[PDB]
Every structure is written in C-alpha cells, then in structure tokens.
Design an enzyme around this catalytic site. Structure first.
Site, PDB file in Angstrom:
ATOM      1  N   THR A   1      -3.633  79.752   5.486  1.00 29.04           N
ATOM      2  CA  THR A   1      -4.801  80.162   4.716  1.00 29.04           C
ATOM      3  C   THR A   1      -4.729  81.611   4.336  1.00 29.04           C
ATOM      4  OG1 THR A   1      -6.103  78.479   5.868  1.00 29.04           O
ATOM      5  CG2 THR A   1      -7.363  80.200   4.675  1.00 29.04           C
TER       6      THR A   1
ATOM      7  N   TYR B   1       2.434  74.470  15.705  1.00 24.66           N
ATOM      8  CA  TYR B   1       1.649  74.108  14.540  1.00 24.66           C
ATOM      9  C   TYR B   1       2.352  73.003  13.755  1.00 24.66           C
ATOM     10  CZ  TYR B   1      -0.462  75.186   9.846  1.00 24.66           C
ATOM     11  OH  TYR B   1      -1.004  75.173   8.588  1.00 24.66           O
TER      12      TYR B   1
ATOM     13  N   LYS C   1      -1.731  73.594  17.400  1.00 26.88           N
ATOM     14  CA  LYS C   1      -2.604  73.309  16.262  1.00 26.88           C
ATOM     15  C   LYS C   1      -2.110  72.035  15.653  1.00 26.88           C
ATOM     16  CE  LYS C   1      -3.964  75.245  11.741  1.00 26.88           C
ATOM     17  NZ  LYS C   1      -3.680  76.385  10.872  1.00 26.88           N
TER      18      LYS C   1
ATOM     19  N   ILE D   1      -8.628  75.614  14.612  1.00 26.48           N
ATOM     20  CA  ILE D   1      -8.215  76.706  13.721  1.00 26.48           C
ATOM     21  C   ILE D   1      -8.619  76.298  12.309  1.00 26.48           C
ATOM     22  CG2 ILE D   1      -6.299  78.059  12.813  1.00 26.48           C
ATOM     23  CD1 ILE D   1      -5.039  77.744  15.718  1.00 26.48           C
TER      24      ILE D   1
END
Ligand SMILES: [K+]
Ligand SMILES: [K+]
Ligand SMILES: [K+]
Ligand SMILES: [K+]
Lengths: 292, 292, 292, 292
Positions: free
Chosen positions: D45, D133, D161, D203
């Site tokens: 992001t 992740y 994540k 997250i």
C-alpha cells in the site's frame, strides 16, 4: 451428418411450456433452406434438463418426422445415471436418428474410469453412433483427452463435442484418435479457431438464428479459407458471446421470436424470461450480424 | 432437527445395486445410538443421482420406518426442473419426514432470479421446512448470499447447506437473514471453522463412520468450546479429506463395509469400485480417526 | 529477428552464481549452429528476477559481443516501475540489440489504463522495437487484446509474447492489430497450436536444449506443414511440459548441464537445485526427444 | 506491536511523485491519536514496487523520525531475490523499526523449498522479527501452511500476514505453530472473520481512513465480542471492498486526499489517477462508513 454447421436446436414452446409443432416445423424448414448440416434435438439448448424422457422422446420423434429425410437428426441422450442413459438411447434405436449426443454425467462427478464405463456401457446397448459431449462448467467434470482416446477405441463412439473453449484439446485429442474420429466445437465464440486447428465443425447455438452464415463459415473453414470465414465470424461474434448474456437458451429463444422463427419465447422454470437489458443486448447483436 | 451433526447417509446396496434393508437398519441403529441429530435420506451421498424417483421415495420411506421415531429424517428432494422438484416434494407430504434438502438446479445454470423462482415455487406447494443446498463444484451454479436473503423471507425456507467451502459465506448470509435461519456446512473439512464463524451444524459425510465424534464435536462447537472441538476435528481431518479421494460416496461406502456397518460397498454406475490406492488412503484415515 | 524459433536463453552461472562466459559462448555457438532465429537475453528464463540491473546489462552486452553479429539479440527490459523500465531500456539504446522484451508490471497489478501508460512511456523513450510480454500466472495481471490493439498503434510497439496458453488470444489480438504486428507464443506446450492459428513464432524455453528441432518445427509451421511439424512437437512435448516440473529455469539449467552445454546448473536463490525426482523426470524427457 | 489494527500506510507524494513529509506527519499524528497498533512503512500500500531501495529507506526513516517513539514502525523489506531481501534488511538494522514485513518472492514462482530457503536466509542475517507475507494474487506463488510451520521454528520468524482471503488457512497454520506465532489478516473484507477464527489482528488498507473504528473493531474481536465488532465491520465493508475498485493504493490515496489527511493523491506509474466512476464509488463507501 457429423461435420459442418450443426444446430443445437431450441425446443420451441407454446405459452403453456409444451412443444409448439408449427414453430418446430418453421425452424426445421429454415435449417433445410439454410444449408445446416444436421440438427441436434433436445441437447442442452433444447432444454433437455426440464423435459421428462417421454416429452424428450416426443420432441425428437416430431423433429425427425418434420425433417422428413431432408436433414439428419442427432438425438440428445445424456443422463447422469448410466441406466437412464441406456434407457433413453434405447427409445431411439431403429428410429431414423443418425446418432446420439451424450454428455458426461453431471452433478455426481465420476472419475475418468467412471466416464469410461458409463460411455462404454451406453455404446454397447446401441448400434447408433455416439458423440461424446464435454462441458465441465455445466457438469462439474472434465472428460480428458486420454479418456477420449480410450473411448474412441469403441466401434460406435465416433466423435466429441468439446465445449470447454480450451483450444489445446483439439490436437491433444486428435493425436490419440483415428483420423475419422470427429472433433466438433461446443463453444460458438472459439469454434472457428477450433476448426482452424483441425476440428471438423461445430454444434452451435448461434446457428439457431444465423443458420446461413454459420453454414457458409464452416464450409469456408473446411476449404481452408480462414480469412474469409473470419469476416463472417466477426459479424457473428457479438451473437456468439451475447447469446449467453443470460442462461442458454433464454437469449436464443428471444432472438428466434424476434426474427419470427418461433411463435413464443416461453421456457420452463428454472429458466426465466429475458430481462429488458438482455433484450437490448441481444437485439444489438442481431443488428450487428445484419439479421434485423 | 436442523442443528448439530446431521449425517448425509449412504444408501447401502446389495451386489445388484438395490437398497439393502438389513444394512440400512444397522446404519440407522448406529446413528440413534451415537447421538446423530438427524438423517438426510437420499442426498448426494445417498446416490440421489442414480436412483429413480420411485426408488428414491422407497429409500426415504424405508428410512422413516426403520428410524421408527427415534431420529428425525430429512428427505433429499432436489431436481433441476422446478416441476420435478415440486412433484418429488409431494411424494413426501405427510410421510413423517421433518423437512427437505433441496439443491440448486444442476447443469442448466439458472440465474439468481431463476433460483429464486425455483425455490419459491417449491416452498409454496408444501408445508415442509426447506433447506437450500449450494454446491457450485457439482452443479455449475452458485446461490449467492443476496438471493439466500430473499428466499429466507419465505416462511418455510428455514436454512441452507452451504457446501462451497468458502467460509466468508457464513457471515454474508447471517447478516441478511433472521436469527432463526439455520446455517449448515456441507464441507466436512471446513465445517468446524464454519461453526466457529456462526454456523449451526453440518450435513456430513464423515458422520457416516465417525458419528459419535462428530456429534460431540458439533455440541462443543455450539457451546463455544472450539479448542476442545478442534482436537476431535484434527483426528477426523484425514477422513474429512480422503472420503473424497475418489468420488463420493465411493470412499465412505468402502469405509462402512470395512467397519461392518454395511454388507457390500456396491454403487451404481457411473460410480465404480474403489481403487487399491484409495483403499490404502481411506484405511489410513480410519486408523488416524481411531476407528480401526 | 522477431519470428521463428527464438530462445529465452539461460544465464549460465559458475558455482558462485555469476555469469559463466565459457558456457554462454558455447550456448550462443550452439544457437548459431542450430538455426535459432534470435536470442532473448535476460528474460524470465535468464533469471532477470535475481540479477541486478548492472549484472543484467553485463550479461546482455556479453551475449551481444559473443553473438558477434551472427544471430540477433533481444534484451529483456521488464520492470514493475515505469521509471525503472525506462532506465533499463536506456542502457541498451544504440547497443546492437535489435529490440526489447518488456513484461507487464508484476506484483502491483496495474489497470489496463496503467499498462497502456506504462508501455507507451517506455516506447517513447527509445527507438528500439518493443515486444510486449503477458504472463498472468507470474505477474498477477493480464494484458487484454483490446489494450494490445491500443498499444500496437505506437510506432515501435511491434509484437507480443503471449504466454497465457489461452489460444483464443491469437485471433483476438490479430483482428485488432496490423498485419505486420508479430504474435509469438510464450508457452512451449501450445506454441505449435499458436502458430497454426496465425502466430509467427515462439519465445521458447525448450529451444535451450532442442534448438535444432525447434528451428525445424517453426520453419515447417511457417510453411503450413503442420502435420510434419506435429511429429517434431510430439517428440518434444514431454520437454515442453517437464521443463516446468520445478520452477523455470531449474529444469532447463540441469538439462543444459546434462547435455554438456553449460559447466554448472547453478542458480540464484530463491531458485534451488533440482530434486532427484526432478532430474529423472527431465532425463526421461530428454531421452524421449532423442537428445541423450 | 504485532497485534490489533496495523495500518499499511500510504506513502503520500507531491505532484512530482516524491514523498511529502507534511502529509506523512499528518497521517502519523492521526494514527497515534486514533489508537492504531503499529505502522507498516512501504508495504504494498506504500508503493514498495515503485520506490527504489534508497527512497524506500528514506520513507521508513522519515516515518520513524515523525513517529518519534509514539507508535511502532514495521518496515516492508520484501524482494524476489534473496540477496536483495537480505541487503534491504541490513539497511534497517538498528534503525528503531520493531520488525520487518517480508513478501514471498513475486514473478519467479519459487518452490516451497525455495520459499523456505529464502525466508530462512533473511531471518539468519538479522535480529529483527520477521513477518511473512503471502499474497498469491499478486506474486504468482502461495506459501502453504506446511512451509509456514517449518519457518515458524526459526526464532525470529514471528508471524504471517495472510492475504489470500482463504479463511481455512487460519487454523491450518495455527495448528502447526506455537501459540506465540502471530496470525494477521491481509484482506480487509475477511479480516474480522479471520480474527474470529483465531487471528490476532490485521495489516489493513481501510485503517488508513477509518483508524479508530478499525482499532476498536480489532480490540472487540480480541476480547471475543464478535457481534459488537461486526456492527463496525458492516459500516466499513463498502470501504473494505471498494478501496480495491481500482488498483491499491489509487482509491485509498484519493480517499486520504478527500478527507484532508494528505495534500495530493499522486502516485507513480504504472498506477494512474482514479477514474470518475471510482471517485463516486469510493465517496459512497466513505459516507457509508460515516467519514464524510
Ligand atoms: K470408434
Ligand atoms: K424463513
Ligand atoms: K506498431
Ligand atoms: K519463531
């Protein structure tokens, strides 16, 4: 008989949801006039799902009568129970139909061995030519090339309607079967591509309303004139796509009614009438094909 | 009863593929003794696909008779033609069944509006509670939460068997329906997760051979004791997966025979006998579960 | 230069993971001898992912030097940041490379508008011919035919490496672009099919170890001799498939070492050495191709 | 801190695409005041893809400086080359960050063994806590629970994540790892479900503009008050979905600008400006959330 433009013909209905003879006659005359190669009677597009086996058989026999030897008729004979497939096929033994279109069992997701035993048993109970039919998006199972090759060894299993839209299947199947085994597209939007790769024709929804163009396109393809065929394909591509804007055969029945080919666009539940948005989409596609 | 551990019971068959009353009795006695909440008779696991409606009805009636009031019976009543679903449902009116398990039409891929009209019409013509059944992998269509919410407003549409294995559906549906609407997993491997998210039970294949563990697992889940439920789930997880190593109900029928619950593991085509590899896999899973 | 059999050449490495000049020279001599049409330097198969831009550039320049004008060299120039794509491309401006292979941005999943702006900006900063590269399974995005048509209007965007394995893309793209826009397969197993539909060649992994056969196959295809090409394809099909048995280029580097074409099969992490099972699978495929 | 509401913060930019310190300050002040647990600096992001490593490091250092000890900072450190991941990680050693968020290699599709060796090597060469992740939609690979279990045995690999949106992963991973291993959702729309199943936090993209609601939602979830958490989730659900109506972070940056949290909504190519339709969609979602 098992090549060229083959129509998966709608079962036209009156407002009560029963077969309309006047409309069926008009459709069949249209296909004879149009150069359609054969008619698949009570396949998917013909609402095999919502006709009982008696009604199914009545439509097939009516279609055969009305064809009057002018155009070959292939009966839809699919069932997800092997016993039922055998029983349905037996209804047409010594009837005048030239062959059967039989779909992989739906819902119960048999193994490739199960598919083999299913189609082998069916073939053993008939002298009729069998065309296998693979359409995983509807059935939940996928008849793979290897199994097709196995089944092509059975004398009366003579072709496949491959409706995956996965063009790699053409040459995968072709290399495992004899040269006289027929490869037919069951996916209108990719059917020309399918013929360009070696396919022998299409069992088509679009042919219900563009029979002449479809016949012409397939003839050109068979002759190796793909660029010329492609011009026709491009004119028809919006129909190839939009005839599935709502579940088949809702759009194609509407289209037939709009062209005056059938008296009503009535279907049986769980098929529902075309939406307003649907109508306009399909009308635009008909216009693009030059049919209005 | 529409909560807790509900078995999707096998239809035990003799070597001729005919229902075996003695085996069915043993199974029913087993579920009564093992605390199973209810029996789903002739669902997918009961070979709904390969019994004709008369045989189907016979099995449901035999199951009621043998149950003899000791355990509730839910009839599978699914059909892909709305008229057929309605007719099948009428065969069970005033039979003693407590409700119906009715699948989204398979093969013809109706729209959401089509599904709405299908289930609405079915519900209208019975007083029996209806449990919707969504299993896109088998049917080719997906009954979405929005449409479940519409249908839940029908008095006697009381719950859903959600067999996607997509756990996001639990709270998508829950937020659209009343608090008395029942959410049941149709996917054994994710069923405990489904219950932890708000689900009320499971319509289970695994329960055919691990009835007591399933019943306790579901009770603990209902009480919020997820860690304790999970220990049981972990010993059952190999079964939850491997009972689908070959097409359901091939593995679970073999498992039932191996345990002595049924006389033969015979199925109807297009189901075929379990492979040697399959036996090994299933045997291992039974042992992991402490059953052999 | 942008048709026929084009090799996505491995970057051979010493045991330290740096480019091995002796091995690169041997490979390039092999491709010249074999009739390979061009070399893609530091594409995916060349471990573009794990070389920094300086190392990447060193390999491209070394490849160009060693080619010594005997065989055209296309530089991999892909980056998921447009600024980085521009900078990498600028390294090769006025270098001797004949064009660039530039992949859709990976990881950040731009829109079709983003893809348009990305490739347009790159094209505007170079006089080099640009070949677009679509491989959704690796990138998380899919450059659709419509956008390809939009980009083909840019003077120096002259072709596409279509690695979806979705053969319908051939004619979808072809109808939207000029007749001199090149269509190349990026999927070895479907590449002959791709050429049969109108494609102009393949950017190939298999060509690393079957350069002669691949050149011959593509020549036959270009001449319309598809049956003859198919015989070669059938001999190579196990390599086309099994060279991806473990992540590319782990199998093809092993194959190169086994054939004596490179000194070591060393790769950079996160690529790991071939498994024992992998070795045997690939060896069997080499044997099937007649290369052992 | 590695639990609760963790924001994947945007990297606010001026019109030249350079980090805007004043905007970043406002955002950080906002998260301190709104109870956000931690800040992930230059994750997906934060446009990790289009900042070079030096700019990346600058943003992380600026974020630490502005945070001034008031809120923990986690650095995005992902790279698809293991050597690069290691080098990037060293830039942050002794920086003040509390841990690293490290993505599975994108584009090169390593094996499970490859992923294992990648993350093991990264963890070996730092004292910093590592959060794995997994986001297959973006990367082309899927770090499976078995491999997560292997990696969790590494001292400083402390959590994951999990961005699949596949909720079955929660308990598949949980059963393989110690009770102190942290499970964090990376999929806003399913995050509350993920927490209800055993997850410890999120997250979040949505937290960029609904920080206080997210913080309360996650606290209620941690306390077992799922119905109360769900009311907040329902008002945020349109944002959870529509913040991805166009590629992240295009929507959330526009949303931040509309709220006055950042001076401009500028991004770097291949991200392009939000469409008018997108603005409308996002605006509607903000209003549903009570934010405008
Ligand atoms: K045959
Ligand atoms: K109700
Ligand atoms: K051009
Ligand atoms: K650890």
């Amino acid at each position: 008989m098992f090549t060229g433009s083959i129509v998966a013909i709608v079962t036209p209905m009156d407002e009560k949801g029963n077969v309309c003879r006047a409309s069926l006659k008009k459709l069949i005359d249209y296909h004879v006039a149009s150069g359609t190669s054969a008619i698949v009677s009570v396949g998917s597009t013909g609402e095999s799902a919502t006709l009982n086996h008696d009604e199914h058989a009545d439509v097939v026999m009516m279609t055969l009568d009305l064809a009057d030897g002018r155009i070959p008729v292939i009966a839809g004979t699919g069932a997800n129970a092997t016993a039922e497939a055998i029983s349905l096929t037996q209804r047409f033994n010594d009837s005048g139909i030239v062959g059967c279109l039989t779909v992989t069992p739906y819902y119960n997701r048999p193994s490739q061995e199960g598919l083999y035993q299913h189609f082998k048993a069916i073939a053993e109970h008939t002298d009729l030519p069998q065309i296998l039919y693979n359409v995983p998006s509807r059935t939940g199972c996928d008849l793979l090339p290897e199994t097709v090759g196995r089944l092509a060894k059975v004398k009366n299993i003579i072709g496949i309607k491959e409706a995956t839209g996965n063009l790699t299947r053409v040459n995968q199947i072709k290399e495992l079967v004899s040269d006289d085994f027929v490869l037919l597209s069951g996916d209108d939007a990719s059917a020309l591509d399918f013929m360009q790769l070696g396919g022998h024709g299409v069992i088509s929804v679009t042919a219900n309303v563009a029979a002449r163009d479809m016949a012409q396109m397939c003839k050109l393809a068979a002759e190796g004139h793909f660029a010329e065929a492609r011009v026709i394909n491009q004119r028809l591509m919006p129909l190839h796509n939009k005839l599935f804007v709502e579940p088949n055969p809702i759009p194609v029945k509407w289209a037939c009614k709009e062209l005056g080919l059938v008296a009503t666009d009535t279907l049986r539940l769980p098929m529902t009438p075309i939406t307003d948005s649907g109508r306009e989409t399909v009308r635009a596609a008909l216009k693009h094909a030059g049919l209005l």
